[PDB]
Specification:
Elements: E1 9-12, E2 18-23, E3 28-35, E4 41-44, E5 64-74, E6 77-89, E7 98-109, E8 120-123, H1 139-146, E9 153-159, E10 166-173, E11 181-189, E12 200-205, E13 208-209, E14 222-224, E15 231-234, H2 235-249, H3 256-259, E16 264-266, E17 279-284, E18 291-296, H4 298-301, E19 302-304, E20 307-310, E21 312-315, E22 319-321, H5 323-326, E23 329-334, E24 339-345, E25 355-360
Parallel strand pairs: 3-8, 4-7, 14-22, 15-21
Antiparallel strand pairs: 1-10, 2-3, 2-6, 4-8, 5-6, 6-7, 9-10, 9-23, 11-24, 12-13, 12-17, 15-22, 16-20, 17-18, 18-25, 19-20, 23-24
Bound molecules: the ligand N=C(N)NC(=O)Cn1c(-c2ccccc2)ccc1-c1ccccc1.
Amino acid sequence: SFVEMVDNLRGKSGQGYYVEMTVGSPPQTLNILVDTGSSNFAVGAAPHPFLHRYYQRQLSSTYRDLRKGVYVPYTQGKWEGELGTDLVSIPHGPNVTVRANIAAITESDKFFINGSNWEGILGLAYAEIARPDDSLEPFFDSLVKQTHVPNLFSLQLCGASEVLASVGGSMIIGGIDHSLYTGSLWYTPIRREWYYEVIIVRVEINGQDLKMDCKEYNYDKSIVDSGTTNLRLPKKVFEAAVKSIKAASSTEKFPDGFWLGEQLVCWAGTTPWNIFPVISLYLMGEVTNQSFRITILPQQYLRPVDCYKFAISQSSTGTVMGAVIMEGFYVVFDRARKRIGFAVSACHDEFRTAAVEGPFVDCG
Ligand SMILES: N=C(N)NC(=O)Cn1c(-c2ccccc2)ccc1-c1ccccc1
């Protein structure tokens, strides 16, 4: 009920956000990672060391084989499965049940994470990048086609023995829950419908323009992906960023392992938040020379591990606006209007606030 959908996501810091879902008949319960950076509905369907629970096609009276496998390799692992179809529901989402394609994973390589608690993955991006090809209708596409839920979904990623801290959030499917944000919603166009691709026109490491040709901010592409933790930047922008960040926090000093994202830096509640600057990402607006900025605090790019890890890393796939950027913002994936809206979140110190400000006046 939007209301029924509030706080329907759980996660372990840095390990993603999942939503409970059910598959088959009787309903099999599973936690599924919400990924706007992929397009397959893939779930474990065979025993695994990190899996304490998986999809059993055998118990589903409504399961249907497609006889057609799916092999998906990547630099580090893979997941192989058998393609199928079955009934799927989201208990704390819309009150509907649709028949969707399901990639039943039977063999994997560094796919599943130890102790994350999700058993599958919900690829929420377009068919362009779906495996094995674009003929395998992504889950959301089946949802809208069958039920008559509106082509749009929102994500309010929130953030925060010893254990990784637990995170919470909401995935409101079919609409916009106005109590999840304050201020107005600024939309940036979806450049192309494959990944949720957008355009960054300018960047600032607190007031200072990085002054690069904007094509660099999107060198290759720029995407909004909940399935990625860190804010990943093209090598050139990345180094320009760290330099600026190191120059502003210098009244403090740390090792390279820290900036290379592979090392923590701890202080308790003494944390020097204010030495670290805010990062402003201006996104192309709906009107050609109009843009708007989303400003993020160190509380965002310094992920807790008191200890923290630098949540900004280098990339050769382009820019990736991951969880650490989406947090503190209510993000709207308006597939119907082909755009993405940003607004300060209900989720979210007394000197600086994350912000969504506009407007401002060849980047892709
Ligand atoms: N980068 C993304 N947005 N999405 C993926 O990489 C999805 N993905 C994939 C994947 C690769 C190609 C096509 C469909 C899914 C393999 C492993 C993951 C994964 C698993 C757990 C946590 C994070 C990623």
